[PDB]
Design a protein around this ligand. Structure first.
Ligand SMILES: O=P(O)(O)OC[C@@H](O)CO
Ligand SMILES: [Cl-]
Length: 168
């Protein structure tokens, strides 16, 4: 109620604050990570998420990668209870100029959609992966059509660009 998304489109809400406050206020069950393929969270949003978990995310990721194949853009694996009652799914998105940049992204959002509970997710493969926002948003917006979802908006730019993208 008393922290309001700066924009709501359908069942989808957009919040730009810092991660602690938001996660604390929204009480999500799954937090989505804009992930590597090899789960190295060295900057951007995945860095934040990791710190947020006191690095427990990284810890789990390494282990994960010693009995499991790296992650193909277009997919996601969920780590349950990374912190108590908080799960992270690492969704790897496409880098700008792979094949089916679009159909990959879509699957990601599709995976994100199937998760149970309240979700908070950054906009996918839109940072150092360099896919333009219009596309990711468009994918997400198009793919997850009937589900409450909370997009974490990570920077002032992400914000402006999202503003434009809703020009009515
Ligand atoms: O997928 P994006 O959002 O572009 O970021 C990749 C990131 O995991 C590198 O640290
Ligand atoms: Cl950064």
């Amino acid at each position: 109620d008393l922290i309001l998304p700066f924009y709501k489109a359908g069942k989808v809400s957009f919040y730009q604050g810092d991660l602690d406050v938001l996660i604390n206020f929204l009480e999500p069950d799954v937090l989505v990570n804009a992930a590597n393929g090899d789960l190295r969270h060295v900057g951007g949003v995945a860095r934040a998420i990791d710190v947020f978990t006191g690095g427990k995310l990284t810890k789990r990721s390494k282990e994960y990668l010693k009995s499991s194949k790296a992650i193909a853009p277009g997919n996601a694996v969920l780590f349950e209870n990374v912190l108590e009652h908080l799960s992270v799914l690492n969704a790897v998105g496409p880098r700008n100029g792979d094949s089916r940049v679009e159909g990959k992204l879509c699957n990601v959002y599709k995976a994100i959609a199937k998760c149970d509970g309240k979700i908070l997710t950054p906009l996918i493969s839109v940072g150092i992966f360099k896919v333009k926002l219009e596309v990711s948003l468009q994918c997400l917006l198009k793919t997850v059509t009937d589900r409450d979802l909370n997009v974490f908006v990570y920077t002032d730019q992400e914000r402006v660009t999202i503003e434009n993208f809703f020009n009515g």
